[PDB]
Amino acid sequence: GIVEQCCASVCSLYQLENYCN
Amino acid sequence: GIVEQCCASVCSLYQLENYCN
């Protein structure tokens, strides 16, 4: 998931918007 | 000690209360 992907690999801020309400 | 145990293993917040004044 994001927590794992941002912490095992890299993620972008665009991917982070997906978890905003 | 706490610094080492919280950083080598895991500690709980209850254990942290021990070092408050």
Place this chain on the structure above:
Amino acid sequence: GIVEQCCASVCSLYQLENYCN
């Protein structure tokens, strides 16, 4: 550089003053 040296080894605050404006 600083980012690399502070993160691969240790640096001191005196070394940090070098990058202030």
Place this chain on the structure above:
Amino acid sequence: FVNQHLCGSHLVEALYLVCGERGFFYTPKA
């Protein structure tokens, strides 16, 4: 924008910085 490696309480800050007023959900796997 740049690709970031984020782990910890450091990440949830980026969740706040990204989100803000929308609020977020923080869902780790355990």
Place this chain on the structure above:
Amino acid sequence: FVNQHLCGSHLVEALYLVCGERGFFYTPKA
């Protein structure tokens, strides 16, 4: 409450969050 892995300046924040008005002592081994 949950069991936390804490290392660094990140930890002393939890010392403040836990303690607060009591104040704390921060004693590393060196």
Place this chain on the structure above:
Amino acid sequence: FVNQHLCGSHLVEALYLVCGERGFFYTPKA
């Protein structure tokens, strides 16, 4: 003062704490 290991967004805080009103430049290698 003591010798610090600094990595990340954690470092730039020390850049602010060290510098402050002078401002700083943050130059990683990439």
